[PDB]
Design an enzyme around this catalytic site. Sequence first.
Site, PDB file in Angstrom:
ATOM      1  N   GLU A  52       0.197  -1.675  -0.083  1.00 39.72           N
ATOM      2  CA  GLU A  52       0.218   0.523   0.544  1.00 39.72           C
ATOM      3  C   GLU A  52       0.990   1.507  -0.536  1.00 39.72           C
ATOM      4  O   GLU A  52       2.317   1.750   0.416  1.00 39.72           O
ATOM      5  CB  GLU A  52      -1.108   0.474   1.096  1.00 39.72           C
ATOM      6  CG  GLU A  52      -2.360  -0.844   1.314  1.00 39.72           C
ATOM      7  CD  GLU A  52      -3.526  -0.562   0.856  1.00 39.72           C
ATOM      8  OE1 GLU A  52      -3.371   0.787  -0.205  1.00 39.72           O
ATOM      9  OE2 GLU A  52      -4.280  -0.846   1.454  1.00 39.72           O
ATOM     10  N   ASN A  54      -0.885   4.811  -0.948  1.00 42.85           N
ATOM     11  CA  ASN A  54      -2.649   5.234  -1.297  1.00 42.85           C
ATOM     12  C   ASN A  54      -3.219   4.470   0.064  1.00 42.85           C
ATOM     13  O   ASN A  54      -3.794   3.393  -1.509  1.00 42.85           O
ATOM     14  CB  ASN A  54      -2.730   6.065  -2.521  1.00 42.85           C
ATOM     15  CG  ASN A  54      -4.136   7.059  -1.955  1.00 42.85           C
ATOM     16  OD1 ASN A  54      -5.580   6.461  -1.663  1.00 42.85           O
ATOM     17  ND2 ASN A  54      -4.321   7.899  -2.532  1.00 42.85           N
ATOM     18  N   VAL A  57      -7.155   4.664  -2.620  1.00 40.01           N
ATOM     19  CA  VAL A  57      -7.531   4.115  -3.995  1.00 40.01           C
ATOM     20  C   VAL A  57      -6.637   2.647  -3.985  1.00 40.01           C
ATOM     21  O   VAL A  57      -5.897   1.845  -3.407  1.00 40.01           O
ATOM     22  CB  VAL A  57      -6.463   5.665  -4.548  1.00 40.01           C
ATOM     23  CG1 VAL A  57      -6.881   5.165  -6.123  1.00 40.01           C
ATOM     24  CG2 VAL A  57      -6.998   6.306  -4.256  1.00 40.01           C
ATOM     25  N   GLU A  62      -1.372  -4.116  -4.650  1.00 42.90           N
ATOM     26  CA  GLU A  62      -2.007  -4.142  -3.426  1.00 42.90           C
ATOM     27  C   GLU A  62      -2.180  -6.359  -2.759  1.00 42.90           C
ATOM     28  O   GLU A  62      -2.421  -6.251  -3.403  1.00 42.90           O
ATOM     29  CB  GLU A  62      -3.337  -3.716  -2.962  1.00 42.90           C
ATOM     30  CG  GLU A  62      -2.475  -2.016  -2.591  1.00 42.90           C
ATOM     31  CD  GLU A  62      -3.314  -1.628  -4.379  1.00 42.90           C
ATOM     32  OE1 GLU A  62      -3.785  -2.376  -5.371  1.00 42.90           O
ATOM     33  OE2 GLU A  62      -3.772   0.259  -4.428  1.00 42.90           O
ATOM     34  N   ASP A 171       7.662  13.283  14.683  1.00 41.46           N
ATOM     35  CA  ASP A 171       7.261  12.210  15.502  1.00 41.46           C
ATOM     36  C   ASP A 171       6.971  11.145  15.139  1.00 41.46           C
ATOM     37  O   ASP A 171       5.597  11.731  14.573  1.00 41.46           O
ATOM     38  CB  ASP A 171       6.909  12.747  17.429  1.00 41.46           C
ATOM     39  CG  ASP A 171       6.578  11.681  18.243  1.00 41.46           C
ATOM     40  OD1 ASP A 171       7.650  10.532  18.080  1.00 41.46           O
ATOM     41  OD2 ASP A 171       5.855  12.169  19.162  1.00 41.46           O
ATOM     42  N   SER A 172       5.808  10.321  15.391  1.00 37.25           N
ATOM     43  CA  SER A 172       4.769   9.237  15.102  1.00 37.25           C
ATOM     44  C   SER A 172       3.909   9.596  15.911  1.00 37.25           C
ATOM     45  O   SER A 172       3.841  10.437  17.309  1.00 37.25           O
ATOM     46  CB  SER A 172       5.430   8.071  16.105  1.00 37.25           C
ATOM     47  OG  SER A 172       5.822   7.633  17.009  1.00 37.25           O
ATOM     48  N   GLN A 174      -1.023   8.569  16.429  1.00 44.20           N
ATOM     49  CA  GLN A 174      -1.681   8.074  16.964  1.00 44.20           C
ATOM     50  C   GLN A 174      -2.283   7.436  14.874  1.00 44.20           C
ATOM     51  O   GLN A 174      -1.388   8.364  14.262  1.00 44.20           O
ATOM     52  CB  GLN A 174      -3.306   8.380  17.294  1.00 44.20           C
ATOM     53  CG  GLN A 174      -2.975   9.018  18.506  1.00 44.20           C
ATOM     54  CD  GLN A 174      -5.010  10.043  19.291  1.00 44.20           C
ATOM     55  OE1 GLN A 174      -4.296  11.141  18.572  1.00 44.20           O
ATOM     56  NE2 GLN A 174      -5.344   8.889  19.339  1.00 44.20           N
ATOM     57  N   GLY A 175      -2.655   6.353  15.037  1.00 40.24           N
ATOM     58  CA  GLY A 175      -2.232   5.860  14.027  1.00 40.24           C
ATOM     59  C   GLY A 175      -1.031   5.040  13.551  1.00 40.24           C
ATOM     60  O   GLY A 175      -1.022   4.097  11.933  1.00 40.24           O
ATOM     61  N   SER A 177       0.604   3.508  14.995  1.00 37.35           N
ATOM     62  CA  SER A 177       1.189   2.074  16.599  1.00 37.35           C
ATOM     63  C   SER A 177       1.378   1.533  15.967  1.00 37.35           C
ATOM     64  O   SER A 177       0.213   1.322  15.263  1.00 37.35           O
ATOM     65  CB  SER A 177       0.045   2.209  17.255  1.00 37.35           C
ATOM     66  OG  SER A 177       0.081   4.030  18.414  1.00 37.35           O
ATOM     67  N   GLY A 178       1.858   0.457  15.810  1.00 32.76           N
ATOM     68  CA  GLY A 178       2.507  -1.339  15.419  1.00 32.76           C
ATOM     69  C   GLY A 178       3.355  -0.552  14.479  1.00 32.76           C
ATOM     70  O   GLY A 178       4.097  -2.058  13.749  1.00 32.76           O
TER      71      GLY A 178
HETATM   72  N1  LIG Z   1       4.252  10.052  20.417  1.00 29.82           N
HETATM   73  C1  LIG Z   1       4.006   9.279  19.423  1.00 29.82           C
HETATM   74  N2  LIG Z   1       5.227   8.574  19.686  1.00 29.82           N
HETATM   75  C2  LIG Z   1       2.747   8.518  19.422  1.00 29.82           C
HETATM   76  C3  LIG Z   1       2.605   7.165  19.413  1.00 29.82           C
HETATM   77  C4  LIG Z   1       1.606   6.665  19.135  1.00 29.82           C
HETATM   78  C5  LIG Z   1       0.413   6.839  19.478  1.00 29.82           C
HETATM   79  C6  LIG Z   1       0.674   8.264  20.182  1.00 29.82           C
HETATM   80  C7  LIG Z   1      -0.790   8.630  20.658  1.00 29.82           C
HETATM   81  C8  LIG Z   1      -1.109   8.234  22.399  1.00 29.82           C
HETATM   82  N3  LIG Z   1      -0.157  10.037  23.296  1.00 29.82           N
HETATM   83  S1  LIG Z   1      -1.266   9.850  24.690  1.00 29.82           S
HETATM   84  O1  LIG Z   1      -0.208  10.600  25.505  1.00 29.82           O
HETATM   85  O2  LIG Z   1      -2.611  10.423  24.377  1.00 29.82           O
HETATM   86  C9  LIG Z   1      -0.574   8.148  25.846  1.00 29.82           C
HETATM   87  C10 LIG Z   1       0.425   8.376  26.252  1.00 29.82           C
HETATM   88  C11 LIG Z   1       0.343   7.138  27.042  1.00 29.82           C
HETATM   89  C12 LIG Z   1      -0.749   5.768  26.888  1.00 29.82           C
HETATM   90  C13 LIG Z   1      -0.581   4.765  27.908  1.00 29.82           C
HETATM   91  C14 LIG Z   1      -1.710   3.875  27.713  1.00 29.82           C
HETATM   92  C15 LIG Z   1      -2.968   3.940  27.413  1.00 29.82           C
HETATM   93  C16 LIG Z   1      -2.931   5.447  26.679  1.00 29.82           C
HETATM   94  C17 LIG Z   1      -1.856   6.099  26.477  1.00 29.82           C
HETATM   95  C18 LIG Z   1      -2.110   7.452  25.809  1.00 29.82           C
HETATM   96  C19 LIG Z   1       0.112   6.852  22.713  1.00 29.82           C
HETATM   97  O3  LIG Z   1       0.517   7.112  23.200  1.00 29.82           O
HETATM   98  N4  LIG Z   1      -1.218   5.873  22.288  1.00 29.82           N
HETATM   99  C20 LIG Z   1      -2.260   5.912  21.594  1.00 29.82           C
HETATM  100  C21 LIG Z   1      -3.531   4.959  22.135  1.00 29.82           C
HETATM  101  N5  LIG Z   1      -2.458   4.055  22.642  1.00 29.82           N
HETATM  102  C22 LIG Z   1      -1.493   3.914  23.782  1.00 29.82           C
HETATM  103  C23 LIG Z   1      -0.470   4.455  22.480  1.00 29.82           C
HETATM  104  C24 LIG Z   1       1.980   8.869  20.118  1.00 29.82           C
HETATM  105 CA   LIG Z   2      -4.363   1.581  -2.571  1.00 36.00          CA
END
Ligand SMILES: N=C(N)c1cccc(C[C@H](NS(=O)(=O)c2ccc3ccccc3c2)C(=O)N2CCNCC2)c1
Ligand SMILES: [Ca+2]
Length: 223
Positions: A52, A54, A57, A62, A171-172, A174-175, A177-178
């Site tokens: 992937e 986009n 689309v 894919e 920085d990385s 939400q979304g 993650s993983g």
């Molecule tokens: N700054 C980053 N590099 C980053 C990376 C991934 C996700 C997030 C958003 C979020 N940041 S946050 O301040 O809202 C936060 C921080 C620590 C957490 C620990 C446990 C549960 C939720 C948490 C949320 C988060 O850390 N989590 C998303 C939801 N689930 C766990 C990871 C931030």
């Molecule tokens: Ca695609």
Amino acid sequence: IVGGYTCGANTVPYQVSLNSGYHFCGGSLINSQWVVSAAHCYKSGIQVRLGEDNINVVEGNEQFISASKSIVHPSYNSNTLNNDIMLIKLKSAASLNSRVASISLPTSCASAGTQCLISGWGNTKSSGTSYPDVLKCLKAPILSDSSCKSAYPGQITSNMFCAGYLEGGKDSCQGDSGGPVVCSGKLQGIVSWGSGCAQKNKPGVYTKVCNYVSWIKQTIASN
Ligand SMILES: N=C(N)c1cccc(C[C@H](NS(=O)(=O)c2ccc3ccccc3c2)C(=O)N2CCNCC2)c1
Ligand SMILES: [Ca+2]
């Protein structure tokens, strides 16, 4: 990815998008049938999407394969996010080619200073919500443990490492993650958490994959 840049179509061939009617997490292809993601991304009804760029689309290249089983690490703690690692087995093996390839596991941990490539389709804004269509990339160094711990007192375990910029802005988020954290062609980390996104003196914390190579290997060999 906040402060990153557009990767380029299929330049990160091991990047995986976990989809359930929408993209909710990333992952990395470690072999034709196994994906390594974050435990906190666990959900039922997971479709793994390879090749992937986009995500909205169908451009070609894919491969949509259903997850046959998701193995969340047994000692994963949802509050501390310690042992934040999960293995996804594909119902069918992926067709490894140029645009869909696996990434190697580390045979040793990376040291502070090492430059790594982090990627994903997560939020691109620090103050707000904006999700990209195409894959974003970000180069960031693994910080020192003293620095990592000075930023997150009593929250960093030996299975976590900080990567990013103390000045903020990159920085990385939400979304993402993983998603992978590749250093020297070796998957060194998994996007786990952080206090907000791209904040000053609050770098991203990632799952130290080098502490799990044995577990991964043994788990994959038994399933
Ligand atoms: N700054 C980053 N590099 C980053 C990376 C991934 C996700 C997030 C958003 C979020 N940041 S946050 O301040 O809202 C936060 C921080 C620590 C957490 C620990 C446990 C549960 C939720 C948490 C949320 C988060 O850390 N989590 C998303 C939801 N689930 C766990 C990871 C931030
Ligand atoms: Ca695609």
